[PDB]
Short mmCIF file of C-alpha atoms in Angstrom, two decimals:
data_model
loop_
_atom_site.label_atom_id
_atom_site.label_comp_id
_atom_site.label_asym_id
_atom_site.label_seq_id
_atom_site.Cartn_x
_atom_site.Cartn_y
_atom_site.Cartn_z
CA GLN X 1 57.21 65.49 74.64
CA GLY X 2 55.09 68.46 72.43
CA UNK X 3 52.12 70.18 74.08
CA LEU X 4 49.47 67.75 71.15
CA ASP X 5 51.15 64.27 71.98
CA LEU X 6 51.60 64.25 76.50
CA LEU X 7 48.34 65.40 76.47
CA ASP X 8 46.10 63.17 72.97
CA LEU X 9 44.87 66.76 72.85
CA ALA X 10 41.59 66.76 70.16
CA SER X 11 40.51 68.45 67.04
CA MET Y 1 63.52 42.61 80.62
CA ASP Y 2 64.32 45.36 84.03
CA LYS Y 3 62.34 48.30 84.63
CA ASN Y 4 64.92 50.20 83.05
CA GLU Y 5 65.76 48.15 79.65
CA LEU Y 6 62.27 48.46 78.84
CA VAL Y 7 61.62 52.36 79.21
CA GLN Y 8 65.48 52.40 77.42
CA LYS Y 9 63.96 50.02 75.06
CA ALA Y 10 60.30 51.77 73.87
CA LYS Y 11 62.21 55.08 73.45
CA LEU Y 12 64.83 53.62 70.83
CA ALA Y 13 61.44 52.12 69.43
CA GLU Y 14 59.77 55.12 68.82
CA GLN Y 15 62.87 57.09 67.49
CA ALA Y 16 62.34 54.17 64.63
CA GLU Y 17 59.26 55.18 64.72
CA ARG Y 18 57.41 51.66 66.35
CA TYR Y 19 54.55 52.35 67.81
CA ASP Y 20 53.01 49.24 69.39
CA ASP Y 21 56.19 47.29 70.16
CA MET Y 22 56.21 51.07 72.54
CA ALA Y 23 53.86 50.02 73.82
CA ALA Y 24 54.25 47.13 74.58
CA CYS Y 25 56.84 48.04 76.56
CA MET Y 26 55.35 50.92 78.45
CA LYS Y 27 52.61 48.74 79.67
CA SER Y 28 54.88 45.94 80.89
CA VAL Y 29 56.20 48.74 83.37
CA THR Y 30 52.59 49.75 84.04
CA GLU Y 31 52.16 45.89 85.15
CA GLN Y 32 54.92 45.82 87.27
CA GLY Y 33 52.70 47.70 89.59
CA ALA Y 34 55.52 50.34 90.48
CA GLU Y 35 54.29 54.14 89.94
CA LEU Y 36 55.37 55.92 86.70
CA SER Y 37 57.40 59.08 86.60
CA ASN Y 38 56.52 61.82 84.81
CA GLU Y 39 58.75 60.64 82.01
CA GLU Y 40 57.48 57.22 81.78
CA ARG Y 41 53.64 58.60 81.64
CA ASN Y 42 54.30 60.54 78.26
CA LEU Y 43 56.26 57.56 76.45
CA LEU Y 44 53.08 55.62 77.39
CA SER Y 45 50.99 58.60 76.16
CA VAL Y 46 52.73 58.98 73.10
CA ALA Y 47 52.87 55.12 72.50
CA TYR Y 48 48.58 54.53 72.73
CA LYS Y 49 48.38 57.81 71.29
CA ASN Y 50 49.69 56.70 67.90
CA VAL Y 51 48.20 53.47 67.85
CA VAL Y 52 45.01 53.87 68.49
CA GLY Y 53 45.28 57.13 66.11
CA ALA Y 54 46.21 54.99 63.00
CA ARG Y 55 43.08 52.93 63.97
CA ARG Y 56 40.47 56.13 64.11
CA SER Y 57 41.28 57.22 61.12
CA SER Y 58 41.16 54.88 59.32
CA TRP Y 59 38.00 54.36 60.95
CA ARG Y 60 37.72 57.62 59.04
CA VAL Y 61 37.85 57.06 56.39
CA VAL Y 62 36.44 53.29 55.79
CA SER Y 63 33.46 54.59 56.94
CA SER Y 64 33.24 57.51 55.20
CA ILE Y 65 33.84 55.36 51.75
CA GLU Y 66 30.76 53.53 52.97
CA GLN Y 67 28.21 55.74 53.25
CA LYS Y 68 29.13 57.65 50.33
CA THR Y 69 28.31 54.42 48.09
CA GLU Y 70 24.91 54.10 47.35
CA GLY Y 71 24.88 50.22 47.32
CA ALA Y 72 26.91 49.00 45.45
CA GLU Y 73 25.45 46.27 48.22
CA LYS Y 74 28.31 43.87 48.05
CA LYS Y 75 31.21 47.16 47.88
CA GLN Y 76 29.12 48.35 50.30
CA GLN Y 77 28.96 44.53 52.33
CA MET Y 78 32.89 44.65 51.86
CA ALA Y 79 33.37 47.90 53.44
CA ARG Y 80 31.38 47.23 55.81
CA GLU Y 81 33.01 44.84 56.70
CA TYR Y 82 36.39 46.22 56.28
CA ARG Y 83 34.57 49.14 59.19
CA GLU Y 84 33.87 45.65 61.22
CA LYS Y 85 38.04 44.69 61.27
CA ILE Y 86 39.24 47.77 62.10
CA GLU Y 87 36.67 48.53 64.22
CA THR Y 88 37.58 45.12 66.38
CA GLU Y 89 41.13 46.13 66.61
CA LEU Y 90 40.03 49.86 68.14
CA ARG Y 91 37.80 48.35 70.57
CA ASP Y 92 40.59 45.52 71.15
CA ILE Y 93 43.17 48.52 72.21
CA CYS Y 94 40.91 51.06 74.42
CA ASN Y 95 40.35 48.60 75.97
CA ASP Y 96 44.20 47.58 77.16
CA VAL Y 97 43.87 51.18 78.11
CA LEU Y 98 41.64 51.27 80.17
CA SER Y 99 42.53 47.89 82.23
CA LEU Y 100 46.18 49.93 82.60
CA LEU Y 101 43.85 52.86 84.15
CA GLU Y 102 41.21 51.23 86.05
CA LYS Y 103 44.13 48.03 87.42
CA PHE Y 104 47.49 50.52 87.58
CA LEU Y 105 47.44 54.26 86.38
CA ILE Y 106 44.44 55.63 88.41
CA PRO Y 107 44.74 53.86 91.90
CA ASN Y 108 48.73 54.57 92.25
CA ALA Y 109 48.70 57.76 91.18
CA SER Y 110 49.35 60.51 94.47
CA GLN Y 111 50.03 63.68 93.22
CA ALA Y 112 46.37 65.74 91.95
CA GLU Y 113 48.30 66.40 89.02
CA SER Y 114 48.40 62.74 87.84
CA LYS Y 115 45.67 61.47 89.24
CA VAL Y 116 43.71 64.47 86.84
CA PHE Y 117 45.93 63.26 83.57
CA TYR Y 118 44.57 60.03 83.93
CA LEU Y 119 41.00 60.74 84.64
CA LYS Y 120 41.32 63.20 81.58
CA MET Y 121 43.34 59.75 79.81
CA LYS Y 122 39.52 57.77 81.30
CA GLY Y 123 37.64 60.03 80.00
CA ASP Y 124 39.67 59.92 76.24
CA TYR Y 125 39.61 56.14 75.78
CA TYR Y 126 35.46 56.02 76.08
CA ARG Y 127 35.65 58.88 73.72
CA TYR Y 128 37.41 57.20 71.59
CA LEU Y 129 34.64 53.94 72.09
CA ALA Y 130 31.64 55.98 71.57
CA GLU Y 131 32.71 56.42 68.44
CA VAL Y 132 32.12 53.86 67.09
CA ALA Y 133 29.34 52.82 68.96
CA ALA Y 134 26.30 52.19 69.02
CA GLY Y 135 23.22 52.40 69.75
CA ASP Y 136 22.07 49.57 73.11
CA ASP Y 137 25.81 49.88 73.69
CA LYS Y 138 26.46 53.80 73.01
CA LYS Y 139 25.11 55.58 76.22
CA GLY Y 140 26.50 53.55 79.12
CA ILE Y 141 29.82 54.19 77.02
CA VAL Y 142 29.27 57.87 76.97
CA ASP Y 143 28.22 58.23 80.78
CA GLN Y 144 30.86 56.51 81.37
CA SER Y 145 33.48 58.81 79.78
CA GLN Y 146 31.74 62.48 81.31
CA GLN Y 147 31.91 61.05 84.77
CA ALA Y 148 36.33 60.33 83.82
CA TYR Y 149 36.52 63.53 82.22
CA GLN Y 150 33.40 65.41 85.11
CA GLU Y 151 35.78 64.34 87.63
CA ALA Y 152 39.39 65.33 86.82
CA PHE Y 153 37.39 67.86 85.72
CA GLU Y 154 36.37 68.66 89.88
CA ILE Y 155 40.12 68.31 91.07
CA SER Y 156 41.63 70.21 88.58
CA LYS Y 157 39.41 73.50 89.14
CA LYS Y 158 40.31 72.24 93.69
CA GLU Y 159 43.69 71.47 92.85
CA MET Y 160 45.66 73.33 89.84
CA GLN Y 161 45.90 76.90 88.72
CA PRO Y 162 44.32 77.41 85.29
CA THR Y 163 47.14 77.80 83.62
CA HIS Y 164 48.65 74.51 84.27
CA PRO Y 165 48.71 72.69 81.13
CA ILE Y 166 46.99 69.54 82.75
CA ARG Y 167 43.67 71.96 83.68
CA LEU Y 168 43.54 73.17 80.39
CA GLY Y 169 44.20 70.23 77.58
CA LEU Y 170 41.08 68.80 79.82
CA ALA Y 171 39.49 71.39 78.86
CA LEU Y 172 40.01 71.59 75.46
CA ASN Y 173 39.41 67.76 75.58
CA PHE Y 174 36.60 67.55 77.58
CA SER Y 175 34.87 70.70 75.42
CA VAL Y 176 35.14 68.35 72.50
CA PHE Y 177 33.41 65.40 74.26
CA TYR Y 178 30.70 68.26 74.24
CA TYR Y 179 31.06 69.60 70.96
CA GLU Y 180 31.32 66.27 68.94
CA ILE Y 181 29.68 63.39 71.04
CA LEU Y 182 26.87 64.70 73.44
CA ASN Y 183 25.80 67.26 70.91
CA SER Y 184 25.74 69.89 73.01
CA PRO Y 185 27.14 73.30 71.51
CA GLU Y 186 26.68 75.79 73.77
CA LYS Y 187 27.94 73.91 77.18
CA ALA Y 188 30.75 73.13 74.88
CA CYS Y 189 31.62 76.51 73.88
CA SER Y 190 30.96 77.52 77.71
CA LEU Y 191 33.25 74.87 78.97
CA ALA Y 192 35.96 76.37 77.01
CA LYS Y 193 35.88 79.78 77.35
CA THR Y 194 35.70 79.87 80.77
CA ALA Y 195 38.54 77.94 80.90
CA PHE Y 196 40.43 80.62 78.31
CA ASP Y 197 38.82 83.73 80.53
CA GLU Y 198 40.08 82.14 83.89
CA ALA Y 199 43.75 81.31 82.40
CA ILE Y 200 44.17 85.20 81.20
CA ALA Y 201 42.84 86.00 84.47
CA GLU Y 202 45.98 84.47 86.45
CA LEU Y 203 48.93 85.10 84.28
CA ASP Y 204 51.34 85.83 87.10
CA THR Y 205 50.38 81.94 87.80
CA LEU Y 206 52.93 80.89 85.09
CA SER Y 207 56.26 79.54 85.18
CA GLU Y 208 59.41 79.24 82.46
CA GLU Y 209 58.94 76.11 82.69
CA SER Y 210 55.85 75.10 80.58
CA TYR Y 211 54.39 78.57 79.80
CA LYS Y 212 54.78 77.64 76.48
CA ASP Y 213 53.03 75.15 76.92
CA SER Y 214 49.39 76.55 78.60
CA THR Y 215 49.91 80.00 76.18
CA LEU Y 216 49.69 77.29 73.33
CA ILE Y 217 46.51 75.24 74.37
CA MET Y 218 45.07 78.88 75.16
CA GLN Y 219 44.77 79.42 71.65
CA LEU Y 220 43.87 75.87 70.47
CA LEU Y 221 40.22 76.51 73.25
CA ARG Y 222 40.15 79.91 71.14
CA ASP Y 223 40.20 78.16 68.09
CA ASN Y 224 37.48 75.75 69.12
CA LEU Y 225 35.27 79.30 69.93
CA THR Y 226 35.94 80.76 67.06
CA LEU Y 227 35.10 77.96 64.84
CA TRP Y 228 31.97 76.78 66.82
CA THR Y 229 31.06 80.41 67.08
CA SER Y 230 31.52 81.50 63.14
CA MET M 1 37.70 35.47 47.36
CA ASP M 2 37.77 35.88 43.55
CA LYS M 3 40.24 38.34 42.38
CA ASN M 4 37.90 41.24 41.68
CA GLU M 5 37.34 41.63 45.31
CA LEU M 6 40.84 41.28 46.77
CA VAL M 7 41.84 44.11 43.82
CA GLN M 8 38.58 46.35 45.81
CA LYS M 9 39.73 44.76 49.31
CA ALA M 10 42.71 46.36 48.18
CA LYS M 11 42.66 50.12 47.74
CA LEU M 12 39.91 49.91 50.40
CA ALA M 13 43.45 49.28 52.47
CA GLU M 14 45.31 51.69 50.58
CA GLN M 15 42.84 54.44 51.62
CA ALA M 16 42.62 53.35 54.84
CA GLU M 17 46.53 53.41 55.35
CA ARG M 18 46.78 50.38 55.78
CA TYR M 19 49.46 49.36 53.68
CA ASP M 20 50.44 45.50 55.24
CA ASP M 21 46.58 43.81 53.68
CA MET M 22 46.81 45.65 50.80
CA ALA M 23 50.02 43.69 49.98
CA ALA M 24 48.67 40.11 51.00
CA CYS M 25 45.94 41.10 48.99
CA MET M 26 47.63 42.10 46.14
CA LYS M 27 50.12 38.96 46.91
CA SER M 28 47.38 36.39 46.89
CA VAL M 29 46.08 38.60 43.22
CA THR M 30 49.70 37.45 41.86
CA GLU M 31 50.36 33.91 43.55
CA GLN M 32 46.33 33.56 41.27
CA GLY M 33 49.18 32.91 38.61
CA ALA M 34 47.95 35.09 35.36
CA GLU M 35 49.41 38.71 34.45
CA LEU M 36 48.94 40.98 36.02
CA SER M 37 47.12 44.19 34.63
CA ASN M 38 48.73 47.61 34.72
CA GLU M 39 46.44 48.62 37.77
CA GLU M 40 47.12 45.31 39.48
CA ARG M 41 50.95 45.99 39.07
CA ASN M 42 50.57 49.39 40.85
CA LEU M 43 48.31 48.38 43.53
CA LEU M 44 51.01 45.61 44.57
CA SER M 45 54.07 47.99 44.03
CA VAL M 46 53.21 50.59 46.14
CA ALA M 47 51.61 48.17 48.82
CA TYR M 48 55.43 46.36 49.51
CA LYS M 49 57.34 49.78 48.64
CA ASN M 50 55.02 51.51 51.92
CA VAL M 51 55.76 48.27 54.07
CA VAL M 52 59.02 47.37 53.32
CA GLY M 53 59.54 51.74 52.90
CA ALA M 54 59.05 50.96 57.18
CA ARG M 55 61.54 48.90 57.97
CA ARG M 56 64.12 50.73 55.68
CA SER M 57 63.55 53.83 57.46
CA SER M 58 63.51 52.50 60.74
CA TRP M 59 66.87 50.91 59.92
CA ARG M 60 68.53 53.35 59.09
CA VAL M 61 67.44 55.73 62.44
CA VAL M 62 68.15 51.90 65.14
CA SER M 63 72.04 51.91 63.06
CA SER M 64 73.01 55.21 63.75
CA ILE M 65 72.63 55.18 67.70
CA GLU M 66 73.46 51.55 67.36
CA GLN M 67 77.05 53.62 65.99
CA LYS M 68 76.80 56.80 67.98
CA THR M 69 76.94 54.84 71.51
CA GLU M 70 80.19 54.80 73.70
CA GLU M 71 77.78 50.94 77.21
CA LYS M 72 74.79 47.63 77.14
CA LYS M 73 72.60 50.52 75.30
CA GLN M 74 75.03 49.67 72.52
CA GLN M 75 74.21 45.76 72.57
CA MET M 76 70.39 46.68 73.03
CA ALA M 77 70.17 48.91 69.66
CA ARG M 78 72.76 46.24 68.14
CA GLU M 79 69.58 43.34 68.80
CA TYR M 80 67.23 45.54 67.99
CA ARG M 81 68.79 46.84 64.36
CA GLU M 82 68.47 42.83 63.45
CA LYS M 83 65.15 41.92 64.41
CA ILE M 84 64.24 44.54 61.89
CA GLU M 85 66.40 43.44 59.41
CA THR M 86 65.26 40.10 59.86
CA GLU M 87 61.17 41.95 59.06
CA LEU M 88 63.13 43.91 56.41
CA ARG M 89 64.79 41.08 54.62
CA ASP M 90 61.51 38.21 54.38
CA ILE M 91 60.26 41.64 53.64
CA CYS M 92 62.15 41.37 50.37
CA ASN M 93 62.63 37.75 49.62
CA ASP M 94 58.62 37.25 49.21
CA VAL M 95 59.16 40.32 47.18
CA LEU M 96 61.96 38.54 45.13
CA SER M 97 59.65 35.01 45.14
CA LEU M 98 56.85 36.76 43.00
CA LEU M 99 59.40 38.37 40.50
CA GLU M 100 60.71 34.75 40.46
CA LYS M 101 57.83 32.62 40.42
CA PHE M 102 55.23 34.69 38.07
CA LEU M 103 55.59 38.30 37.63
CA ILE M 104 59.10 37.86 35.52
CA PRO M 105 57.71 34.99 33.48
CA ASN M 106 54.30 36.28 32.74
CA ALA M 107 55.45 40.05 31.41
CA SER M 108 54.17 39.26 27.64
CA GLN M 109 54.78 43.39 27.02
CA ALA M 110 58.58 45.52 27.22
CA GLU M 111 57.18 47.05 29.01
CA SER M 112 56.27 45.34 31.93
CA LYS M 113 59.14 43.15 31.66
CA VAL M 114 61.32 46.04 32.06
CA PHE M 115 59.15 47.34 35.10
CA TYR M 116 59.60 43.93 37.06
CA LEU M 117 63.53 43.35 36.74
CA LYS M 118 63.56 47.49 38.17
CA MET M 119 61.76 45.69 40.98
CA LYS M 120 64.27 43.08 41.44
CA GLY M 121 66.63 45.31 40.92
CA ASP M 122 65.70 47.11 44.18
CA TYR M 123 64.60 44.35 46.61
CA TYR M 124 68.17 43.53 46.48
CA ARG M 125 69.22 46.52 46.18
CA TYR M 126 67.41 46.31 50.45
CA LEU M 127 69.30 43.22 51.02
CA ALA M 128 72.48 44.29 49.57
CA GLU M 129 71.68 47.97 52.75
CA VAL M 130 72.14 45.69 55.02
CA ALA M 131 74.10 42.26 54.27
CA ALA M 132 77.62 43.65 54.57
CA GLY M 133 78.80 40.35 55.56
CA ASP M 134 80.45 37.15 52.96
CA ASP M 135 76.77 37.40 51.71
CA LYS M 136 76.63 40.84 49.46
CA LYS M 137 78.98 40.45 46.30
CA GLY M 138 76.58 37.52 45.84
CA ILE M 139 72.96 39.76 46.79
CA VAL M 140 74.68 43.36 45.38
CA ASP M 141 75.73 41.60 42.20
CA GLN M 142 71.82 40.04 42.29
CA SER M 143 70.89 43.26 42.24
CA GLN M 144 73.18 44.51 39.12
CA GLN M 145 72.09 41.86 36.70
CA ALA M 146 68.53 42.47 36.85
CA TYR M 147 68.71 46.47 36.72
CA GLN M 148 71.69 45.93 34.27
CA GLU M 149 69.57 43.67 31.86
CA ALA M 150 66.36 46.27 32.70
CA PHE M 151 68.46 49.14 30.89
CA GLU M 152 68.93 47.10 28.06
CA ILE M 153 66.23 46.19 26.80
CA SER M 154 64.68 49.41 27.85
CA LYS M 155 66.92 52.14 26.14
CA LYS M 156 65.74 49.64 23.29
CA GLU M 157 61.99 49.38 24.04
CA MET M 158 61.19 52.71 25.27
CA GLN M 159 61.44 56.12 24.64
CA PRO M 160 64.02 58.04 26.69
CA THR M 161 60.48 60.57 28.31
CA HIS M 162 59.30 56.60 28.69
CA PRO M 163 58.27 57.43 32.48
CA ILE M 164 59.39 53.56 33.64
CA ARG M 165 62.64 53.90 32.04
CA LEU M 166 62.51 57.20 33.71
CA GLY M 167 62.61 56.46 37.27
CA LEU M 168 65.52 52.75 36.48
CA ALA M 169 67.81 55.48 35.35
CA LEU M 170 66.87 57.58 38.94
CA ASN M 171 66.75 54.30 40.92
CA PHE M 172 70.27 52.09 38.94
CA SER M 173 72.19 55.70 39.35
CA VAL M 174 71.25 55.46 42.83
CA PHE M 175 71.97 51.96 43.36
CA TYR M 176 76.59 52.86 41.57
CA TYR M 177 76.18 55.87 43.95
CA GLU M 178 75.59 54.33 47.36
CA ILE M 179 75.74 50.71 46.91
CA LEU M 180 78.24 50.52 44.29
CA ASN M 181 80.48 54.07 45.59
CA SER M 182 80.58 54.96 41.89
CA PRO M 183 79.60 58.81 41.91
CA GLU M 184 81.46 59.04 37.80
CA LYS M 185 79.32 55.76 37.01
CA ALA M 186 76.25 57.36 39.19
CA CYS M 187 76.27 60.71 38.03
CA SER M 188 76.59 59.86 34.43
CA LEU M 189 74.23 57.61 33.68
CA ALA M 190 71.95 60.45 35.53
CA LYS M 191 73.20 62.69 33.05
CA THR M 192 72.86 61.16 30.15
CA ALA M 193 69.19 59.96 31.14
CA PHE M 194 67.75 63.57 31.72
CA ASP M 195 69.40 64.82 28.95
CA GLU M 196 68.17 62.15 26.54
CA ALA M 197 64.45 62.71 28.04
CA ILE M 198 65.02 66.95 27.18
CA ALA M 199 65.85 66.17 23.39
CA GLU M 200 63.19 63.66 22.74
CA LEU M 201 60.75 66.94 23.84
CA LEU M 202 55.51 63.05 25.71
CA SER M 203 51.56 62.43 26.48
CA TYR M 204 54.39 64.58 30.59
CA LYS M 205 53.00 64.73 34.93
CA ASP M 206 54.85 61.34 35.55
CA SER M 207 58.22 62.42 33.27
CA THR M 208 58.96 65.34 33.98
CA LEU M 209 59.15 64.88 37.93
CA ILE M 210 61.37 62.31 37.85
CA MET M 211 63.50 64.92 35.39
CA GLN M 212 63.25 66.48 38.77
CA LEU M 213 64.89 63.90 41.00
CA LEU M 214 67.53 63.04 38.53
CA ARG M 215 69.17 66.40 38.64
CA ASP M 216 68.28 66.54 42.00
CA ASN M 217 70.55 63.78 42.88
CA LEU M 218 72.81 65.38 40.07
CA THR M 219 73.60 69.02 41.88
CA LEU M 220 73.37 66.59 45.24
CA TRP M 221 76.23 64.61 43.88
CA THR M 222 78.25 67.44 42.78
CA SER M 223 78.66 70.24 44.69
CA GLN A 1 49.12 56.90 41.86
CA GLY A 2 51.61 59.54 41.52
CA UNK A 3 55.36 58.95 40.30
CA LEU A 4 57.20 58.36 44.00
CA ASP A 5 54.84 55.23 44.62
CA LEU A 6 53.97 53.25 41.45
CA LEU A 7 57.74 53.80 40.64
CA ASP A 8 59.29 53.21 44.03
CA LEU A 9 61.98 55.77 44.15
CA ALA A 10 64.49 56.00 45.83
CA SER A 11 65.92 59.43 46.72
#
């Protein structure tokens, strides 16, 4: 999984 | 079913974009009580991010409509009621996730990188509750989000390299928590900037494994800094 | 809860992207038994196309996976597919039943009769996609006959640039292509629909967009 | 609503 998704990244 | 099957089911539901089924499967894997593998921890996280992200996004549409309507009482009554039905589902989800983390994910976590991941997530999910709770409860919720993030932050600073995508992702989300939830825009900026600069200064500490992830989150940190600075 | 508030709740659901709520709102509007307005007919259609659209797309993913496996992984994919199919069937049968009890009988204008016969066509066509059983021939024929009657009313009653007539041509041709496996009939139906609209050249945006989709299908099916 | 959604266009 991506960046955005594994880590539930805000913004 | 059996652990390996539950996981295989979660990956099918994932491909079918059926995220509630994916979440129900990963929830049962976690309830078995064994420490999640990195792959399992990622599935559970993707599943609930999508389940809760749908409600948050709907909440924001319907709250926004319920504001823009100078009553129009009825219509506003009805948006308010719908907003409330949505919050109740959103709350129930965050509470399921938060109960998994308290009972199984955080106590079992045997490596720093894991423990940091799950405390970050605990900060995130109390942050989602904070977005939607007030005003009596709101302070105690914001406090729980902050202390989960702070504890994750002290571990990662002690145990992880500044370029680790986890440490970086936590600095991204905690800086946003300062910006958006505690309305402190200078603390957000300086948390984000310090994590950006420390990663720049320790580049050599990147590996082929993840450098791609590290650099992408750094670019997101610096995007927020430029948004917040203007 | 009255018709007016059910309709406003449906438009709230739509904007929240909560398509299950939107469908239950429009379904109970339809069960009051009075002929739907245009806006009312549109909302119901949008709601169910999203509800049934999501199962369709999941069905295709999980059946492809089940086809391309050489284990017990196969049996799992098969049983997930079947569970998706039964949700898909229940939604189609809900819509077909609204159609047979209240939408088709209440339709007082030709435009409306054609819209709802098209829709009956589409919903039998979705059943056909997942009913390869001995019940497939009777499903395909229910689809074909709703489309065919839609087609004949629209040709008598509507201009070649009407979007409902153009849309019907698009989906009937898709039905010939993918369900009856008659590419020649698919292509000639789409071609004439396109050329007849072009000739008649309207009070526009939705017509010209369906014209483009007709021609894209023609380009695909010809290579 | 737009043509693809009102008419439930297939591909």
